A paper describes a structure:
Genomic DNA in the eukaryotic nucleus is compacted and organized in protein–DNA complexes called chromatin. The NCP is composed of an octamer containing two copies of each of the four histone proteins (H3, H4, [name], and [name]), around which ∼146 base pairs of DNA are tightly wrapped in 1.65 turns of a left-handed superhelix. In addition to its structural role in genome organization, the nucleosome is the point of convergence for many DNA regulatory processes: recombination, repair, replication, and transcription.
The preceding Arg28 residue adopts a similar orientation as the Xenopus Lys28 residue, but inserts more deeply into the minor groove, interacting with the Cyt-49 (chain J) and Thy-50 (chain I). Remarkably, all the substitutions are of a mutually compensatory nature.
Residue numbers in the entry:
A (entry chain A), E (entry chain E): 37 to 135
B (entry chain D), H (entry chain H): 28 to 122
C (entry chain B): 23 to 102
D (entry chain C): 13 to 120
F (entry chain F): 15 to 102
G (entry chain G): 11 to 119
Write the structure that this text describes.
DNA sequence: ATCAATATCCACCTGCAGATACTACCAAAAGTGTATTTGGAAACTGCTCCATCAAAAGGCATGTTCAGCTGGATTCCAGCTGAACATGCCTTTTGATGGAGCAGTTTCCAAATACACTTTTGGTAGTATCTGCAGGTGGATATTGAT
DNA sequence: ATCAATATCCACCTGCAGATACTACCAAAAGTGTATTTGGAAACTGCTCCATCAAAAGGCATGTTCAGCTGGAATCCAGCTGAACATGCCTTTTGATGGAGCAGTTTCCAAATACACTTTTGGTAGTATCTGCAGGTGGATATTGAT
């Protein structure tokens, strides 16, 4: 029998690893492509300082991470350990984002 | 001699324009007066910020327009912008 | 393949991990992308409005910082 | 003579808003068009709400607009509700809303 | 055999009744004493215009009603119809009112 | 008779079970656990202290002894709870 | 008299003269009194010291000499008062506090 | 030419006082500068409000004090008020 | 309990991105001297309205009994989501060249400010008189729940 | 479905708090006129740094297989919590009175603005040396999970 870690173990390993670091977690380019695309709908042929795109990524991830923490609490309130869309939904509604 | 001005008479004029036979209780009028003041404050403060951000010492109809775009959502913004542009354009058409 | 889909399942999984999430449902990835998209549209729209007002064709860090501040999401380390 | 509101085709007081802009410490200078534009947006917004409120007052068979009508119109209008999401209207109550799961059924 | 509405029926009648009105739901004098007591512990010899106390009551009730709407979403999310302390706490935490 | 001014204590219990039930109803709540009442009183108390503390700070800054509706309205606003209907 | 800057007079490291100029040009009020910038500069320096003081220790508990964004994040979110003051703030490259819900840990929950 | 000021050098000095042998990275300095700018802006704006609410045209150390009491949490407020009062008094007993 | 398979940690090592120390230069920031203006603290007090007392009464709080049905516990299992791999697409980097356009600079005028007069107006105070609707009644219709 | 106990609806009505209506007074507001100052738009442009390439190097996303263990359905039942009821209190309401204290009005100087002039300093730039620590290697040992 080869060596397999049990479901959840590596996950917990990952929680510990990413809560310990500060690195950006989304790939730069894919992210920068998204930004420009969205911006493109409000104004055409826009240029971006490299730092502007960096602020947006820093704010976006802090935002998502923070949202995942609230969503996790909603999953646990339902006595689950798996976050679901309805958990994200409830968190945004209580925050006044969906309300 | 005590003088506390409000927007009540103007809100009343506008009300008679949209609902010629509808009145308004003084509490409701009080709510509306708070609404108009709130809007004034939010827009002026944003315009004020717009001016500082661009090292300008003058608050023009342009800062105001941008403030309105930043503060009001979708449809409301568009109409407010027309109504404002119109009023200014007509205002300047006079000596 | 297109851009919002550029934000991958594993990147989203990493963000969730940082958020202390142990188990992720399959439908989460598309919900997240939708959420990120609304967040960026809201922030960028305001940044661009600040760009246009300054008569520029370049979105600056300060435009973004100012955009974040009015959305109630103040950001430190990029100016102002 | 002829006031600036009239000159601008507005009900809202251009002169007063201009003064209020100066007295408020928003900038060293306040251009002549600033108060015209702001007065126009203020009036437009008050007109929108009063238009809606007046209709709600009509639906409830009242000829007088009260707080409740303002609250109703504001919370049912997706945009007016976002613009005033952090505002509380005294004596406005809330929107009737009962989660579906709380209703009875299945006989007994 | 006397007439008895079933458990929940009167409750639904009350939800419809209070959602239709706009009057204050907390007794006036008792609320005014609560305000005076809390203010008194901050500064002694304070007086209140009667409208200051009414403003506080309108703000307090709008605040509690709104919190009860969120609390109610947390209960329903747990598949209950009964709101509990942990529902209020969940809502206040996501709301940022807490830690 | 000015003496032994009434002493204010335990007034948070003035917010009764029936009053909390009513607010919850306006909030759309159908069923209420027995421990909700004390939790609510606690929550209301924190809310009020924060608002009254700020209102009183505005009052004191103006060198007054009387808390005005504006003081409260100004207090609510800096807490993100703008209130319409009492001035300003 | 050989000039001793307003900061030196107040016994502050922060620029009382700069802060004074910033108050005026910030459209805060028609007039700005002499004490205001002094008091303000002192409050700012103080908070800057409270945070730098904490962040410094955090850098030494990590066996580092140089304070980095992570250090500021950890000292700010672990301090009840500083965390409330900055509850609406995001610290670039700050990351988050290690924290795992007990129910997610090994063997049931 | 091209000039852009910040509180960096002053922050650095304050750092050396409390921690003589500790350095600070540029990104962290940037965060501290934003921090200090943010404190300035929050206190200044609130001081602005208190003066306006009271019909004062002057922002004096008294407005700063109240603004600090309204903006900073308990203990930080107690201390910041000390630091404040202390610096105004030291500054006064001078020339 | 035994032990293999991995992850994780500590001690040490070293190149280099990034922090640091020194010099040179200058606009502008900041302090000083003096002459003029003025915000707002004092002192006095008119007048609003806040605190407080009084008395009556019924709307609503409180305590209690009773049992319906909700929450919480338990059990069961289908199938979703984690772990581990094998591929290999595509981000990442870094090197370096156009050139868009941010940002600094010189002009110059429409529009702002300051200032003096004059005319209009929105707010109020004193008095009086309507009118929309709250609160009540009474009877008709609807909803709920027991059979 | 039928029958009954109650809640809910609505038309009709009456009192009255709030709304509305003239008369009048004037202090601050608002508009007009000239004169004087200037903010920043417009045009030109130098150089900072953003967009695009090239182009390997391989880190990391994607598809696949497998099954552990989680989510959620189905059951059972103690007892919590809702509905109803009796009792009676304390909030609400109505009207009054003293007087604390908020706010208007005038006086007056300590402190701020307005300026001219001298001195100091924080920031940009060059050129150059130093160093905390990221990232890498060993080897030890803690953790996890199968027996
Ligand atoms: Cl879901
Ligand atoms: Cl203008
Ligand atoms: Cl609970
Ligand atoms: Cl001062
Ligand atoms: Mn007490
Ligand atoms: Mn004066
Ligand atoms: Mn039973
Ligand atoms: Mn159940
Ligand atoms: Mn060009
Ligand atoms: Mn008139
Ligand atoms: Mn009625
Ligand atoms: Mn110029
Ligand atoms: Mn299976
Ligand atoms: Mn389970
Ligand atoms: Mn009793
Ligand atoms: Mn007195
Ligand atoms: Mn120097
Ligand atoms: Mn290392």
């Amino acid at each position: 029998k080869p060596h397999r870690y049990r479901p959840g173990t590596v996950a917990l390993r990952e929680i510990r690893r990413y809560q310990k670091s500060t690195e950006l977690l989304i790939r730069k380019l894919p992210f920068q492509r998204l930004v420009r695309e969205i911006a493109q709908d409000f104004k055409t042929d826009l240029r971006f300082q490299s730092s502007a795109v960096m602020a947006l990524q820093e704010a976006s991830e802090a935002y998502l991470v923070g949202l995942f923490e609230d969503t996790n609490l909603c999953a646990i309130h339902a006595k689950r350990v798996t976050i679901m869309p309805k958990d994200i939904q409830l968190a945004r509604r209580i925050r006044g984002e969906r309300a | 001699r005590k003088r506390k001005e409000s927007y009540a008479i103007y809100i009343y004029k506008v009300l008679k324009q949209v609902h010629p036979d509808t009145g308004i209780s003084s509490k409701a009028m009080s709510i509306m007066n708070s609404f108009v003041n709130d809007i004034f404050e939010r827009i002026a403060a944003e315009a004020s910020r717009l001016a500082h951000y661009n090292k300008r010492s003058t608050i023009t109809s342009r800062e105001i327009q941008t403030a309105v775009r930043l503060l009001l959502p979708g449809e409301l913004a568009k109409h407010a912008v027309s109504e404002g542009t119109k009023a200014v354009t007509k205002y300047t058409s006079s000596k | 393949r297109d851009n919002i889909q550029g934000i991958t399942k594993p990147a989203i999984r990493r963000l969730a991990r940082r958020g202390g999430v142990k188990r992720i449902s399959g439908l989460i990835y598309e919900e997240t992308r939708g959420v990120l998209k609304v967040f960026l549209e809201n922030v960028i729209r305001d940044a661009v409005t600040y760009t246009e007002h300054a008569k520029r064709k370049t979105v600056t860090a300060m435009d973004v910082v100012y955009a974040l501040k009015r959305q109630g999401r103040t950001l430190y380390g990029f100016g102002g | 003579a002829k006031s600036r509101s009239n000159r601008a085709g507005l009900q809202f007081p251009v002169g007063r808003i201009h003064r209020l802009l100066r007295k408020g410490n928003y900038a060293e200078r306040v251009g002549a068009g600033a108060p015209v534009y702001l007065a126009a947006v203020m009036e437009y917004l008050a007109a929108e709400v009063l238009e809606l409120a007046g209709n709600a007052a009509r639906d409830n068979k009242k000829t007088r607009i009260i707080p409740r009508h303002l609250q109703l119109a504001i919370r049912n209008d997706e945009e007016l509700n976002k613009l005033l999401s952090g505002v509380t209207i005294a004596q406005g109550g809330v929107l009737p809303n009962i989660q579906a799961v709380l209703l009875p059924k299945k006989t007994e």
